[PDB]
Design a protein around this ligand. Structure first.
Ligand SMILES: Nc1ncnc2c1ncn2[C@@H]1O[C@H](COP(=O)(O)OP(=O)(O)OP(=O)(O)O)[C@@H](O)[C@H]1O
Ligand SMILES: Nc1ncnc2c1ncn2[C@@H]1O[C@H](COP(=O)(O)OP(=O)(O)O)[C@@H](O)[C@H]1O
Ligand SMILES: [Mg+2]
Ligand SMILES: [Mg+2]
Lengths: 463, 48, 489, 463, 129, 129
């Protein structure tokens, strides 16, 4: 009820209460006469609760008053949020008026039980033609996106955001953990440009914010995606939802910064005492229930190019697939620039996909590896020296790379490209035909910027 | 001359392997040193 | 008053209580709301406790009561084919499990004079681990390797292939995603193994207390059959995650840090657990059961799994574990990515029991394969820088290559004792010398086929008896000749 | 005289007392309620004594009562203990009835004075090629084996027991500290079937016991050997004694486990502040004074597989002969894995062993060091570039490294090959011939696991 | 346009003034919040929009888009980039210019390393020519 | 002429006797006053002048000078001459004689490293020939 502030040391604030009732862990508190909310992080006795504030603390003092909500940080969720931008507490920041949904749900909740899990592992079809053949995603699975700016990272995000709603009738949630303000504004305007903003939701927490704000932002996007998945249409089929996170590395870093402020015996290379617990509580709620499913695309950054660091080691135990973007492909003019030799997927086994799909993927990877080993010798020595068989490998690899590039549904403003959503069967058929050797007379130029093997047959017949 | 090219290319590949192993050892040592320094700092700060 | 206390501090799952004067070590405590806690530290004016549950519902000033009985788990033969939490509460929704007796979780192993030497063998279906690294009832072995390298596959293959052999099984999962546990349960139920198996689960979302405690409950449930003359086999899915949970719950206690910020007593935590897998003598069984059963010896095998970073076995926890177990199986990611599956390293993998724990024919046949493999590996690594090699080096390299190709297998494909016997006899005698390397695996398959259709009576005799006499040797040699003489691979 | 338990944490119990009767240091106390013997480790004013509990601590509450024996932990000595198994406190555990002797000795006493030390000069020949050639031993000395987990320390200790104690007239004491139980039972039965049990006393404290029992179990075997040394035949001469300690590292590891609970500050890598003094107060009592001669053999564990750790660094100076085991040589399949370099003995000088012995050992170490130094340029460049003499050094070093291998008597089970024994002069002759250059043409594959130069000739012909 | 002489020296004084006040130690004794300290300063350099200017000045000035640039400076010990503060500041900013010591003494002035010096904005911040 | 068998053992004993006394630790857990411990001991080795000798003995001894040379000993861990204690001792002593394991094992005995061993006093100490 009527509390007091006892100790302001930076963000950490100790708040005293009545003896009988001391707000439980994670119960949000409101400070009278000011915009600031407090989130309990540990109880110390004598009613003292040691908590962290959200937002800056200049102007506060010892002796104020605080009231208790007796509930965690409830965010407003519903269908209204789509197309808006909200704070960590779900407050609008794009100067577009209040949201029109009254449904408040907490962000602190238990994960689904063992009997609530699905009875199967199913695939998610996005028709990118390179993300389905070599690196298949799985409903409920998790993908780690490797690459920085300059290789069109946002273009792929736009394409997936559009495709999830166009083919599987689903909505998406975007949460940005410690992103730069300038590039955030650039992203927002870029998405408003392609007319894709009205299928997504956005939650932003920037670098200038106290680490408490950055740490508990991802849970807001998680709760919104949960509500998008849960609601059932007639026939109760549920929905398939996507969740994007800008860099989980900054999530862990905010976690360890918050641990020190509260004070703790460091562990390992300075990381927090409890490092995996946090990763699990974030990444065990991205699962596939019998009602619906949530997939997650998270971008990752490895410190010091050392995969043995505790943070990459802990986060790598949950990643089901990895996508890598190489600047060399971008320079070669092939979009999207996704490497066909350094991307991994745990779903590429004969048990899940089947026999012929697995054989196709492995055969194309083998041919590409052989071409990668052959290009060095063809450079130092001359092309003619090489055997006729390896030349064939070179030509097939070139055609394969060209075929791996397709137009997008969000680039029709820039070039008038209608956009393609290729079903997987056409991709497998075309690749099997190409590996067989029936597409040996068609010139290579017939493969670039084409959605399907027919388009290639039509394009190749045209010229 | 035909031998020297393959000799130097094999030397370069061996150098790449050696630098990879040395990088592994370097990372292990760096993490150990950081852990030791942090432990010493915390222990000393507990004394005062 | 002396049995009723209050909560004073709640922080990250550790609760410090007051009162509770007649409170003993290890004894459980019941919080309000049907939530239990375990005492860890006594002090001059307070009691420390870890909550085994969801501590977010507990707040200051709540009451707590001391049951008076040590932490114990329900145990019996009714726990077969069920899935339970660390304390034994079912979660699969198949209804309550009747349990006749409850056993303690903190116990010490039988003394020196109450043991016996392991001589009864255990079969897994993998050629390499049987011939190269034999195991036996009562012997502890460790499966160690890099991430996503095949460790859980080998541990499930043993549980599957133990059907038909009167061996119970317990499977403990610590720090696993719920998808993987559900998938494993599905795979177990498909092949009928769950008919004689038990599963204890503690996922990555579960607190540190349950993840730390679960293997003790698994061991206590597996001790029931050993203390009565029957056998049992228990598999800890990841000991490293248990060590990590212990590290977290100790650093939360401000205990002094150490190598890799691990406390001092991280060797006791693993030794007190891994040294309960023992073979007891008939005297111990007779005394424990009060003469109900006589002339029968118990046993309990353990197969814990541990995971290494960047493929080093020189770390702190891996070497702590290696010095406790009677062997280790090292799975190398470099070979796993290269196609050698299961990827096993002959140099590091050993077994301390040796030839005692296997069949007579396998013992006579699989002699000194591991050392030859390790020497071959070293020599081959040396031949890169060498310009000229003599004849003996060439022969050693060829033999090592053939043996390396032979020891390959797929998932869910068990091999009988006779199968391994025939394959190893063919390998040793050099009948594979003229065979092309690339065909060797395929060649192997054909051999077994030609020994199932004909020479079938011998096959049954070897499978049941496991006996070697100049007749068995002559018959196997004659069979091998016929196959190569008149057949295709 | 009756005290009440005040605090129980782990294995450390601190107990109050009356003001005038506080028990002294190292005395033993008995709990009336259960079977437990506590040992005093420190005084804390106000008549409060900190103690380590010998046994289980489950079921012990606060307010339990304790009586004082006013005397340290006494153990029975004499000939009654020949061929029996005893606990840490002397209680028999072989189920063969009580031990009939009233002769009790305390296990805490001062080290022998400087005036009564003795010089050890008589040599002792084991039968192992590398030990009797490069690291020679001498009666009444001290021997140590250093290795990391899984390298071969025990299989060598048991082989030395086989080649020495079985063929020696005199008593023996075997103390096991912090090791596997299965090995203890195997050793007991193996000694029983050979009808040599009646000459050996045994003490066992294994890894399954609380650190209190693992911390003070070496002193009991020490006291038994101490009595067996000073005892003299009536009108007759004394006899030799032998001592075997399975692992002395656990003795310090127990103190490390219980150090922080005693109130001591941490130091170096988490070790207790008082380490070397703790090592010395035990390692000095293993002495061969003017009365009798004790020949002890110990195995020392190397944590994390590096010799720079403080625990194996402090103990290097307490031994006469040190034998260091290497994991690389083990992984190479060479057995026993003893490093020719970094293995020294204080009995290798021209006076004690002669001239030819010294010259042979020096030349061998020189050749091996030369090859180890040469390895790097081979690693980077290749083999053809080195001088022909360096190629000869490479081949000789390989052959020497193989020739140090030898099959054992207690390791027939692992490999299926019978044991072997080699006289010292044969070792000298073989190494002289090898360094001479007369065995150059013999293939290096014939030098593996064969004992004596002749067996090598036969094996070379066999190939 | 603002030019901070050396922030590396701001950090050192922040570490000292924090340790003197008994705040929790961490890697290099640095306090709990250092990344926040540098971000709170380097996130104030932006280019507001005309609506912001009009709202701030109550319509006194319109049509003009305001802007504050920033060029902070950091020095390294023995030419490393993996320390705590250098990594923080590298992560915060929008590009870096590397000045070497090998190039500086070899007579090459100014010593700019074009290999590993980048700017994210790039071509949008240059005149047409 | 005085010889100390191993001041390293002495430094460790000082660390134990100080840590037991509850004194603040530091690099490698060695408390303060570690430099003082070896400096005040190694500074007493010096040569006095004949006037000092004459004054001390009140004229009993005339026309003679006293001296006290020192040769202390310190051990290293795999060549780590950059640890806490060897650097202090190396900074105090006039000269340093280094013994190498890779030289001892090669048969070069005594194993003295000529390229790292120096003496400040130099030729003045030696005889004419
Ligand atoms: N014979 C085989 N052929 C092909 N692949 C195999 C074979 N045996 C095992 N595998 C692969 O090895 C994997 C075994 O899982 P693995 O133990 O590597 O997972 P992990 O993450 O390393 O550990 P955990 O299973 O405990 O999570 C399977 O995914 C399977 O595809
Ligand atoms: N001389 C040897 N010959 C063959 N195998 C050996 C030899 N010495 C040790 N081993 C094997 O190495 C393994 C580890 O050695 P052991 O001494 O039993 O354990 P540790 O090295 O932990 O003391 C054992 O299982 C044993 O079979
Ligand atoms: Mg895994
Ligand atoms: Mg060992």
């Amino acid at each position: 009820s009527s509390g007091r502030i006892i100790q302001i040391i930076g963000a950490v604030i100790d708040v005293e209460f009545e003896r009988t009732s001391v707000p439980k862990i994670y119960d949000a508190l409101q400070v009278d006469g000011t915009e600031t909310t407090l989130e309990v992080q540990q109880q110390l006795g004598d009613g003292v609760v040691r908590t962290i504030a959200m937002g800056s603390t200049e102007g506060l003092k010892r002796g104020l008053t605080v009231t208790s909500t007796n509930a965690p940080i409830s965010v407003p969720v519903g269908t209204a949020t789509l197309g808006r931008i909200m704070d960590v507490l779900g407050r609008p920041i794009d100067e577009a008026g209040p949201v029109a949904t009254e449904e408040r749900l907490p962000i602190h909740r238990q994960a689904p039980s063992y009997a609530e899990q699905a009875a199967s592992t199913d695939l998610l079809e996005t028709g990118i033609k390179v993300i389905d053949l070599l690196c298949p995603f799985a409903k409920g699975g998790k993908v780690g996106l490797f690459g920085g700016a300059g290789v069109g990272k946002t273009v792929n995000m736009m394409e997936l955001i559009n495709n999830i709603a166009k083919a599987h009738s689903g909505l998406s949630v975007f949460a940005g953990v410690g992103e730069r303000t300038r590039e955030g504004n650039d992203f927002y305007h870029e998405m408003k440009d392609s007319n894709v903003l009205d299928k997504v939701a956005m939650v932003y927490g920037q670098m200038n914010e106290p680490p408490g704000n950055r740490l508990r932002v991802a849970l807001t996007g998680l709760t919104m995606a949960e509500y998008f998945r849960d609601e059932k249409d007639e026939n109760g089929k549920g929905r398939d939802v996507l969740l994007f996170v800008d860099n989980i590395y900054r999530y862990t870093l905010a976690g360890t910064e918050v641990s020190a402020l509260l004070g703790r015996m460091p562990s390992a290379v300075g990381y927090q005492p409890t490092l995996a617990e946090e990763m699990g509580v974030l990444q065990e709620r991205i699962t596939s229930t019998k009602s619906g499913s949530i997939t997650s695309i998270q971008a990752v950054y490895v410190p010091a190019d050392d995969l043995t660091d505790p943070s990459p080691a802990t986060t790598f135990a949950h990643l089901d697939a990895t996508v890598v973007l190489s600047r060399d492909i971008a320079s070669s003019g092939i979009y999207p620039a996704i490497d066909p030799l350094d991307s991994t997927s745990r779903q590429l086994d004969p048990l899940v996909v089947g026999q012929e799909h697995y054989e196709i993927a492995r055969a194309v990877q083998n041919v590409l590896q052989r071409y990668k080993e052959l290009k060095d010798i063809i450079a130092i020595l001359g092309m003619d020296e090489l055997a006729e068989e390896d030349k064939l490998v070179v030509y097939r690899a070139r055609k394969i790379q060209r075929f791996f590039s397709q137009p997008f549904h969000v680039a029709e403003v820039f070039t008038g490209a209608p956009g393609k959503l290729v079903p997987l069967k056409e991709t497998i058929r075309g690749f099997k035909g190409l590996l067989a050797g029936e597409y040996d007379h068609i010139p290579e130029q017939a493969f670039y910027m084409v959605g399907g093997i027919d388009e290639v047959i039509a394009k190749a017949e045209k010229l | 001359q035909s031998a020297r090219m393959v000799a130097m290319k094999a030397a370069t590949d061996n150098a790449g392997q050696l630098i990879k192993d040395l990088q592994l050892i370097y990372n292990k040592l760096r993490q150990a040193a950081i852990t030791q320094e942090i432990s010493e700092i915390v222990g000393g700060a507990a004394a005062v | 008053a002396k049995n009723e206390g209050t909560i004073v501090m709640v922080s990250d799952g550790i609760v410090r209580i007051h009162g509770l004067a007649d409170a003993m070590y290890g004894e459980m405590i019941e919080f309000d709301g049907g939530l239990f806690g375990m005492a860890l530290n006594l002090e001059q004016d307070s009691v420390g406790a870890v909550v085994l549950g969801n501590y977010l519902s507990l707040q200051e000033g709540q009451k707590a009561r001391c049951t008076g009985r040590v932490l114990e788990v329900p145990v019996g033969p009714e726990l077969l084919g069920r899935v339970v939490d660390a304390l034994g509460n079912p979660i699969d929704g198949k209804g309550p499990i009747d349990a006749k007796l409850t056993d303690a979780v903190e116990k010490v192993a039988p003394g020196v004079i109450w043991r016996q030497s392991v001589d009864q063998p255990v079969q897994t279906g993998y050629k390499s681990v049987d011939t190269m690294i034999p195991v036996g009832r009562g012997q502890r072995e460790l499966i160690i390797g890099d991430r996503q390298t095949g460790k859980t596959a080998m541990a499930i293959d043993a549980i599957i292939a133990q059907k038909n052999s009167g061996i119970k099984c317990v499977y403990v999962a610590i720090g696993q995603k719920q998808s993987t546990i559900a998938n494993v349960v599905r795979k177990l139920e498909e092949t009928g193994a769950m008919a004689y198996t038990t599963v204890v689960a503690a996922a990555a979302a579960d607190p540190a207390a349950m993840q730390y405690l679960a293997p003790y409950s698994g061991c206590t449930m597996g001790e029931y059959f050993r203390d009565r003359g029957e056998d049992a086999l228990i598999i800890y899915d990841d000991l490293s995650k248990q060590a990590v949970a212990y590290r977290q719950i100790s650093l939360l206690l401000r205990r002094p840090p150490g190598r890799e910020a691990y406390p001092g007593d991280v060797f006791y935590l693993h030794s007190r657990l891994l040294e309960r897998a023992s073979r007891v003598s008939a005297e111990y069984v007779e005394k424990f059961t009060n003469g109900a059963v006589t002339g029968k010896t118990g046993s309990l095998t353990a197969l814990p799994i541990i995971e290494t970073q960047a493929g080093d076995v020189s770390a702190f926890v891996p070497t702590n574990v290696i010095s406790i177990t009677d062997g280790q199986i090292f799975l190398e990611t470099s070979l796993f990515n290269a196609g050698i599956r299961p990827a096993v390293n002959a140099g590091i993998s050993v077994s301390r029991v040796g030839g005692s724990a296997q069949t007579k024919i396998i013992k006579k046949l699989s002699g000194g394969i591991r050392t030859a493999l390790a020497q071959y590996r070293e020599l081959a690594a040396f031949a890169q820088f060498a310009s000229d090699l003599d004849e003996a080096t060439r022969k050693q390299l060829e033999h090592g290559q053939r043996v390396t190709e032979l020891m390959k297998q797929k998932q869910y494909a068990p091999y009988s004792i006779a199968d391994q016997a025939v394959s190893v006899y063919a390998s040793n005698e050099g009948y594979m010398a003229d065979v092309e390397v690339k065909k060797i695996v395929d060649f192997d398959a054909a051999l077994i086929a030609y020994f199932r259709s004909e020479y079938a009576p011998l096959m049954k005799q070897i499978d049941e008896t496991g006996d070697y006499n100049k007749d068995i040797e002559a018959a196997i040699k004659a069979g091998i000749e016929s196959f190569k003489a008149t057949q295709t691979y």
